[PDB]
Design a protein around this nucleic acid. Structure first.
Lengths: 50, 122, 54, 49
RNA sequence: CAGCCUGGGGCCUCGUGAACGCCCUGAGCCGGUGCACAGUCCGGCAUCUCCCUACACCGAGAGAAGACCCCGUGGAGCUUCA
RNA sequence: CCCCAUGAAAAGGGAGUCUGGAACGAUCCCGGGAGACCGUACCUAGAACCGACACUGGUGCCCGGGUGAGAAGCCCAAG
RNA sequence: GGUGCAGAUCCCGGCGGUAGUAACAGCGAAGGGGGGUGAGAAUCCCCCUCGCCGGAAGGGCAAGGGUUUCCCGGCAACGUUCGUCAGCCGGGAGUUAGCGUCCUAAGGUAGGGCCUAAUAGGUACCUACCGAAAGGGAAAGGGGUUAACAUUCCCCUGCCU
RNA sequence: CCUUUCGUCUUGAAACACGGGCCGGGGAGUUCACAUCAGUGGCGAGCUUAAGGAGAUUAUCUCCGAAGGCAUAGGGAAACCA
RNA sequence: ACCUAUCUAGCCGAACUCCCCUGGAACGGGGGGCCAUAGAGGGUGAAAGCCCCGUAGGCUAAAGAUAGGUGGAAAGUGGCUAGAGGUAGAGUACCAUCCCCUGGUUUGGGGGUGGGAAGUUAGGGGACACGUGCCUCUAAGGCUAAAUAUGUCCCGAGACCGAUAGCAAACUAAGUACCGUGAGGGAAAGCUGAAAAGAACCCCGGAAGGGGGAGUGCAAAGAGCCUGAAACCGGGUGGUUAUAC
RNA sequence: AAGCCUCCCGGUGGAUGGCUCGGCUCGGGCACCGAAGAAGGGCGCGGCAAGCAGCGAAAUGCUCGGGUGAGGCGCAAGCAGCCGUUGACCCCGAGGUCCCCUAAUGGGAUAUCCUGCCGGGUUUCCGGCUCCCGGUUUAUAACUGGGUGGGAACCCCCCGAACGGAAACAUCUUAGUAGGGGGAGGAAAAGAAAUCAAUUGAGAUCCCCUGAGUAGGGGCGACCGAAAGGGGGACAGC
């Protein structure tokens, strides 16, 4: 999901309701919304053995 | 050595290349067939006849008249379900639930395939 | 004017046209160069370390 | 039109065929309503040369 | 110091057909209380329901992280004898 | 007439002069032969281009009578 | 263990109310009658009349769009209404030149060389070339013919190399 | 009969502060490494094997491998003492 | 050339469709019988070791490719001991200065700038400099097997997700439609049942997988096709209203 | 009369639940293509043919062997017709064709297009034409014969950032990373000591674990940060 240049529209736009980040027309990249990168994605670097 | 993931396996049977289609046709012969042929299973060909063991129409004997090689199922005459109009359409029954009863000895190229399976002399 | 009429005069030729190499209508005739297919001043193909986000 | 045969000289995927689906093919597919999604139009579009 | 008339809107009728304010639908008014100006709380006054039009008085109406003042060991810019 | 502004260059043509060449020989007329390749539809804008639209915005360019100086206004020709 | 949600002016999808409300006025156009088609007609067609434009709503010409042109058949949307109709959809057809290509200014490039560590960098010098559909630049018009384009096809007169 | 609307910021401020149309789906203290503690177990003046090798039904597994690190004495700069 | 092996290919490969019941279908329940070096797994009208494939194990080459052997040729050709003699890489080391970096610090390496050696009886190095002894190496030219860096790709496995997640991508085309003059940004969208058996046929309308009736089929939620919640709206059921939250 | 509330039913949306020819991680194999014309694009090509995929005017496939063995004519069910037992379709290998641009190189390009000069046979057409190395022929004329670009990451080498951190900030650090340029291969690099260490010892290089945040550096600030030795792997040296 990181393959984006998405960004906030800044503030005082109002039309940009929230500092949600959007790419030149549509929102992405945020942990909370559609398709973007996970909150805390599991990786192979995590320990496994006891 | 071939994998055992379900996904890959299903890909072969949904994508069966042409020269391997006999695989989903071979059905069990009868005892009398193997009695003079010394062979258990073999691929179906046209011009043959079969008997059925499963399905609502169990116990039928017909003739090998229709086939679906690419996906692997056949049909036999004298067994149809009438459409709304009244013309018959062929009942589709899989080789998996059939037993062959006789074959065609008029090819000389299907014959040697029979021979090479270590069946005894002739 | 800065509003719509600024878009008015915009019927003339595209300042970037079909460059023969990369199939992108991005050949700046005016600069004698394509900014997309690289044809014009690099013998090599234009390629960068940042074609995308990494 | 003095188009300098770089766009009309090329014909096909360039300067051709925003075409309707073939008829008999639709019969074959038995599909509900067959389309080419690539459908475009001069008034609403800007062909990228 | 106002008045009359005309065209198009505005009125009505057929067809098409949106967006704004929405914790709510429970909000009438008046004193009072309380963040020191209530729709619900307190005490009175009233208050039948439904519909259409005109008014924007109120809804501390909506529009927009106030354009002002200050803070952040926050930016950018300009200047010089930092 | 004006200028402390003096108002583009090639290819392409034509002619003039001198050298060499062969004697046949046309920038004349008459008859004959040929002459790549590619542009070529439509619209030019109150619906055909752009401005997200079948958008009073812009982008153009050029061109009847009378009344009337008039391409002003009016009306009416062509459409 | 990606782990229990009402919010984060959250994201995304669906649907509310204001609601058949606003608007479908405003920039000087306007239609009416009779007939036809078709299920269905203010809106489409036929006739007549009438009003308006009329240095532009007319006429011819670009860059651009790319079939928007024409024929035949259609209307679920698409058209600010409707719609038998259309630049819309569906089935077919349609541009011809002995009467741009050449050269060149602003300039530009590509190479040889002068630097740059290198370069897809700069380059005063030299060389080669690109650079105008309104610059210059050989030579035709007339009539006539298809629904569709024409100085190009048919005829005569030509004309230039 | 008794009953100020959710959450949050906040001395109280929530009710004239903010964010709040409805419904559904998504959605936020995780990973590693070090340090230190607790709890738990194995062994014990030791502990501990890593990296790594061999065999194996082959990443599981068994054996081997102290390599090393911590503790096992501190003081001071040292010479050293201990 | 030949031989051997390996890779490109396909091939062999066990055991029940036995009985009763349910079930549209048995791949279910009960009973009965069997292979197994093969009970990974997949398919077939459901949950099948023995219905089908595959599996453990084994087999395949014309023709190619890879590896090895089998082949041929050329060049240079004593060993030790003692003595004598000779060779052994320059702007290179090294030094001063400026700069760069690395822990390299009065101590490292590199470069610019200026100087600048010895060179076999040579030199360097052995944490500031110098000297002395002791120890070990020989640059200013080459060249080099393996032991490791990675997934454009191909096999295999998985305490990775089930269609707003999973990489953007599971779909008729995905960097596709598209927004941008431009570098660029960047989508949405899976399920008919097993077999279309896709409702023949009759009535309405012009038509619409539209109405109705019939029919297929276990089932039609039969094309907009699995299941089918709410926000919503409509009909109905049950209460219930115009002096009132 | 509105309704109000709840509930039954229907439609409007499709979450849930289920299913998956998809991706994702891992490990292991494998691991250069290119002027004999790449990769990358642009065009065409089937009976009725749009996209994909495949294909190159020899366009849904051409030939020859090998296997295969009765249907085939893709995605994808229609009309019509054909190929197939004289061995199809398919798969393997070998060939043949293989348009245009493209590093594109006859010359030119704001044309995926136009356009020369030689030599060849000759109807169609075929071969050659920047910067170099070495030869023919005069000592400058042409002629004989062989370095360019791409490739997911990885590798090598030059050039070379700010953001932040120090709660400010300028030395320092973030850091030779981001990035630029060149150049390769399937691995690259490096590789035989002017090496160490120190009681007279070891014996190329590389990577792995330790040594070790030790040594040592710095407004002594954040921080940076070895070597030697030991233990492993293969250990080749001309």
């Amino acid at each position: 999901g990181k393959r984006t240049s998405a960004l906030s529209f800044g503030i005082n736009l109002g039309i940009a309701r929230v500092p949600r980040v959007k790419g030149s027309g549509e929102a992405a990249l945020a942990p909370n919304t559609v398709g973007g990168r996970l909150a805390f994605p599991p990786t192979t670097e995590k320990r496994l053995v006891e | 050595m071939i994998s055992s993931k379900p996904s890959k396996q299903r890909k072969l049977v949904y994508n069966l290349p042409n020269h391997l289609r006999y695989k989903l046709l071979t059905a069990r012969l009868s005892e009398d067939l193997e009695k003079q042929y010394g062979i258990k299973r073999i691929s179906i060909r046209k011009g043959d006849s079969v008997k059925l063991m499963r399905g609502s129409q169990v116990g039928y004997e017909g003739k090998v008249v229709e086939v679906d090689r690419k996906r692997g199922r056949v049909a036999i005459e004298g067994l149809t379900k009438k459409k709304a109009d009244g013309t018959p359409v062929y009942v589709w029954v899989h080789a998996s639930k059939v037993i062959i009863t006789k074959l065609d000895t008029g090819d000389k190229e299907r014959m040697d395939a029979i021979e090479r399976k270590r069946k005894m002399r002739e | 004017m800065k509003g719509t009429p600024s878009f008015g005069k915009m019927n003339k030729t595209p300042t970037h046209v079909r460059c023969r190499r990369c199939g992108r209508n991005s050949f700046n005739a005016r600069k004698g160069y394509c900014a997309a297919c690289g044809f014009g001043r690099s013998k090599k193909i234009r390629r960068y370390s940042w074609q995308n986000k990494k | 039109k003095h188009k300098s045969l770089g766009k009309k000289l090329r014909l096909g995927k360039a300067l051709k065929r925003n075409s309707p689906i073939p008829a008999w093919v639709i019969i074959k597919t038995q599909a509900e309503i067959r389309f080419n999604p690539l459908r475009r139009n001069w008034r609403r579009n800007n062909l990228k040369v």
